[PDB]
Every structure is written in C-alpha cells, then in structure tokens.
Amino acid sequence: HHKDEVALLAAVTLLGVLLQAYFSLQVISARRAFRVSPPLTTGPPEFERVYRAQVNCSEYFPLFLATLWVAGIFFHEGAAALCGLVYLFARLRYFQGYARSAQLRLAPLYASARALWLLVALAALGLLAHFLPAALRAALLGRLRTL
Amino acid sequence: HHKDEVALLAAVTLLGVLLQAYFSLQVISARRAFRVSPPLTTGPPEFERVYRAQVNCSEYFPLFLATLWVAGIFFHEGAAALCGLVYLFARLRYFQGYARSAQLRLAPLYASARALWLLVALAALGLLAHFLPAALRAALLGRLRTL
Amino acid sequence: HHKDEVALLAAVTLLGVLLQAYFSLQVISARRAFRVSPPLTTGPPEFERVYRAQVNCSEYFPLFLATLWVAGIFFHEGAAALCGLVYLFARLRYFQGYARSAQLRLAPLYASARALWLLVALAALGLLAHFLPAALRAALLGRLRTL
Ligand SMILES: CCCCCCSC[C@H](NC(=O)CC[C@H]([NH3+])C(=O)O)C(=O)NCC(=O)O
Ligand SMILES: CCCCCCSC[C@H](NC(=O)CC[C@H]([NH3+])C(=O)O)C(=O)NCC(=O)O
Ligand SMILES: CCCCCCSC[C@H](NC(=O)CC[C@H]([NH3+])C(=O)O)C(=O)NCC(=O)O
Ligand SMILES: CCCCCC/C=C/CCCCCCCC(=O)O
Ligand SMILES: CCCCCC/C=C/CCCCCCCC(=O)O
Ligand SMILES: CCCCCC/C=C/CCCCCCCC(=O)O
Ligand code: NI
Numbered sequence: 559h560h561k562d563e564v565a566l567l568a569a570v571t572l573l574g575v576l577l578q579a580y581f582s583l584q585v586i587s588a589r590r591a592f593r594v595s596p597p598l599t600t601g602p603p604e605f606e607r608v609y610r611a612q613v614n615c616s617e618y619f620p621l622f623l624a625t626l627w628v629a630g631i632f633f634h635e636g637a638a639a640l641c642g643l644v645y646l647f648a649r650l651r652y653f654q655g656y657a658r659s660a661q662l663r664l665a666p667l668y669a670s671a672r673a674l675w676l677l678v679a680l681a682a683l684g685l686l687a688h689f690l691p692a693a694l695r696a697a698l699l700g701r702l703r704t705l
Numbered sequence: 706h707h708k709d710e711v712a713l714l715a716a717v718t719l720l721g722v723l724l725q726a727y728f729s730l731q732v733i734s735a736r737r738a739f740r741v742s743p744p745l746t747t748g749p750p751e752f753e754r755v756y757r758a759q760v761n762c763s764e765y766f767p768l769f770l771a772t773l774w775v776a777g778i779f780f781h782e783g784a785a786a787l788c789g790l791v792y793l794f795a796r797l798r799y800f801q802g803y804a805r806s807a808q809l810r811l812a813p814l815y816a817s818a819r820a821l822w823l824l825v826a827l828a829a830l831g832l833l834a835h836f837l838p839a840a841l842r843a844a845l846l847g848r849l850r851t852l
Numbered sequence: 853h854h855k856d857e858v859a860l861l862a863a864v865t866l867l868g869v870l871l872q873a874y875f876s877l878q879v880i881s882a883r884r885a886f887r888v889s890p891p892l893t894t895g896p897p898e899f900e901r902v903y904r905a906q907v908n909c910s911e912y913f914p915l916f917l918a919t920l921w922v923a924g925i926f927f928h929e930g931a932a933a934l935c936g937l938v939y940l941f942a943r944l945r946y947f948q949g950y951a952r953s954a955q956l957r958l959a960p961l962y963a964s965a966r967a968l969w970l971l972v973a974l975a976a977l978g979l980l981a982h983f984l985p986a987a988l989r990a991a992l993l994g995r996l997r998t999l
Pocket of ligand 4: 560623624630854
C-alpha cells in the first residue's frame, strides 16, 4: 500500500475539512445572531465580515489541497504537512480576526500566504527535480550529435 | 496499477462533477428566465435561490472530494462511495428544493450533512487506525525503560 | 514510485494554482484602483467584472482538478494534461476578457467549457473501460446458467 507515504497529507487534509466545517457553522451562528435568513448574504458589518471570512477561506481551500499533495508527493511529505498545519492555523486566526474587525484579519492573512507560497515553492522544486535531469540529458544527447 | 483500489471513488467523483455542471447550467437558465445578465448576482427571489443553491453546493464540493478520497483510501472504498452517492443525491434534492422555496431546501440539506459527517467519521477512524498503534507502541517502549 | 505516472498532472495542477493566485492578486489590484475595501464586493462595473471573473474561475477550479486527475489516471496522462493546458489558457483569456468587457469573456469561456467536457468525456470513457468488461462477463456468466 501507499497509505504510509501519504497519511500525514491525509490527516492535514481532514483537519482542513474540519476547519472549513467549523467556519460554516460559525456563519450559520452569525445568521442567527444578526438575524439574516437565506438567501441574501448582506446584513450588519459583523455578519458580512464572518460571511466574507468563510467565503475567502472556501475559495483558497482547493489551492491549499492541490499544493499540499503535490509538495508532499514530489518534495517531502513532512515539510508539506508542516506548512499545511501552519497554513491552517493561520487561516483559523484569519477567520477569528476578520470576525472581530477587517483590520485584524490582516496579520494571519499574511501568515497564511507565506505558508501557501512555501508549499508552492516546494511543489515547484519537486517538479523541477523530477523533469529537469531527463530534459538536460535529452538536450546534451541531441547536441552530441555531432559524432 | 492502483486503479482497481480507487475506481469507485473516481466514478463518484465524476458523478459529482457532472452534478455541479448541471447546477451551473440551471443557473444560466435562471439567468435567462428571470432576465439577469452578468456580472450582478441579484434579482428576483427565485433567481437568488437558484444562484445561492449553486454557490453552496460549489462551496461544499471540495469538502466532499477530500473526505471521500481519504475515507475511501484509509477506511473502505465501497462504504465511502456509498456515502458519496447518498451525499450527492441529497445535494441534488437540496438544489431542487431551494429552487422551489428556501424552506424545501432544508430536509435534503440535513441529509447531505449526515452523509458528509459520516464520511468524516470514516476518514477519522481510518486515520486513527493507521497512526494509533505505532504511537502506543512507541509510548510503551519508552516506558520500558525502566530496564 | 508512481510519481512518473502523474508528474504531468501534478505540473498542470501547480500551473492552475499559480493562475488562480494570479487572479487573486488581480482582484486585490482592482480593489485598490477602484477604491473598494473589504468586506463588500460591490463597486464600479469594472471591479465587479474582475471580482466576478475570479469567483467563476475559483468555482470551476475543483471541477477541473477532479476531472484532470480521473482522466489522466483512467484514460491517458498526456491527453488529459493537454486538455488541462488548453483549459487553463482559455481561463486566462476568460479572466482578461471579462476584465475588459462582459461580452469579451464569452469566446474564451466557450473554449474553456469544450476543454473541460473533453476531460469529462475522457474520464467517462476511461471509467467505462475499467468497469464494463467485468460487468458484461458477469452478466453472460449469469445467463450461462442455463447449463
Ligand atoms: C463537514 C460537515 C459539514 C457540516 C455542514 C453544516 S451545514 C452549514 C452550511 N453553512 C454554510 O455553508 C455557511 C456559508 C454559506 N455560504 C451561507 O451563506 O450560509 C450550510 O449549509 N449553509 C447554507 C444553508 O443553510 O443551506
Ligand atoms: C463540466 C463542464 C462545465 C459546463 C460549463 C457550462 S458554462 C456555465 C457557468 N455557469 C455558472 O457558473 C453558474 C454560476 C455562476 N456563479 C454565475 O453566476 O453565472 C458559467 O460559465 N457561468 C458564468 C458565465 O457565463 O461566465
Ligand atoms: C498561492 C498563493 C496565494 C496568494 C495569496 C495572496 S492574497 C489574495 C487574496 N485575494 C483574493 O482572494 C481576491 C478575491 C476575494 N474574493 C476578494 O474579494 O478579495 C485575499 O486574501 N483576498 C481577500 C483578503 O484580502 O482577505
Ligand atoms: C487534486 C489534488 C491532488 C491529488 C493528487 C494525489 C495523487 C497521488 C497519486 C500518486 C501517489 C503514489 C504514492 C506516493 C509516491 C511517493 O511518495 O513518491
Ligand atoms: C485532494 C483530495 C485528496 C487526494 C488524495 C488521493 C491520493 C491517493 C494516493 C495513494 C493511493 C494509493 C492506492 C490506494 C491504497 C489503498 O487502497 O490502501
Ligand atoms: C480529488 C481529486 C482526485 C484525486 C485522485 C488522485 C488519486 C490517485 C491514486 C492512484 C494513483 C496510482 C498510480 C496511477 C496508476 C495509473 O496510471 O494507471
Ligand atoms: Ni504501487
């Protein structure tokens, strides 16, 4: 089985799902507190901030998953998982901040982006490591060629 | 190949994609019926309900995929696929209900959430089964130690 | 390792992540240019068009990933990757068009949908190829039976 090579990625993934669920329930709770009934996603500022925090997190969640898995498979499982943990924690802080004030969402936002780009960089390096040698070899061989 | 261990997950996944596509085309059709042109996502209640049904389904679709795959790999492929089928059916009913009335979206919504949490629980149990024995052993060994 | 069987899918995936990130930064830039501060996602038409382009791309991005991977695993890795590249290029053109005018988003939109349905069709054929023979055999055997 290849379960062993991906269990941490799977665990972080599940943690991310749980965190998103948490955000969703928080939005339903703001819908009750500030009396906003579906459909319609406009209301008091505090509701709009909670709603909006949830929407942004939802929009970024697939980016996180894709890169987490690519980085974890092509670069290193543990590093990718760590960045994922930091990312998710950063996102929890983003949601809480935004819920209190637009400005307080900002620090954890930046933290979440650094973690996410790190995941990207690891994904990119891992892919580069996979493709670049064969390509260079093929290029040298074609030059060779001469002969 | 590991295709055999994941083909049902892949089939349910594809079914989910198809269902989302269906939702999208239904939104374009409500855009024509109630005369709402892009951008701008406000209009009559019925349009806002169709739009909103589609948006919620879209937001939950990655949660579904992640857990489906984790549950299917770490717990049991068939069970995970079944829950996925129920989930997707529940989501189809959610979209149809919401399209008719906000209140009629509610029963299939609850059905979709139960299926989704079941997927989560299976994912969680499977991950627990993978990590917990090695951890307990390591802990016992460290205690041993004495000696 | 099975890295070799999926590296192109992973590369296209990473490219898609990068493209989404690009869209996000473009939205932040329209937020500055046309003075729209979070929360609140209403403003001048040009902002609403950029915002909306980003939202639609985000909503379709998981559909793309799912089908890309299924098609790439069950049908053919290279074909799936190609369709993915075309899709993503089409999406870049969609975002740029929409940013200039609602009508100019339309041609690349259609291009993106054709590529996406092609991915779907490849996913479907690959799954059909996997499941249909065993099913037919089982059915013939049950007929046999007689005897
Ligand atoms: C992993 C298990 C998931 C747990 C599901 C609990 S239900 C919560 C879910 N809440 C949300 O999506 C919040 C955001 C949503 N965009 C909204 O505006 O209501 C919902 O169905 N909201 C809208 C609705 O009531 O239809
Ligand atoms: C799996 C194959 C997918 C089939 C694609 C068909 S195109 C439909 C697609 N429709 C939607 O996304 C509906 C919801 C969207 N949020 C909206 O408000 O228009 C679209 O491009 N909508 C907005 C637009 O016209 O740009
Ligand atoms: C792969 C690496 C990703 C790079 C991240 C850069 S930050 C950009 C990000 N921008 C967006 O999401 C744009 C769309 C968003 N829906 C919005 O309305 O602001 C954001 O956090 N927007 C809202 C906010 O400022 O909180
Ligand atoms: C859409 C999100 C991305 C999904 C990608 C996951 C696909 C994984 C398939 C290959 C895994 C093979 C085992 C790992 C090999 C290794 O660690 O080198
Ligand atoms: C982002 C969504 C999650 C993607 C996860 C899929 C990754 C799968 C890689 C490993 C698969 C190896 C074969 C299955 C082994 C088994 O059934 O025990
Ligand atoms: C949610 C997005 C879909 C994730 C699916 C990826 C799962 C891949 C697991 C199996 C991969 C095994 C190696 C490939 C085998 C082959 O090419 O035939
Ligand atoms: Ni293998």
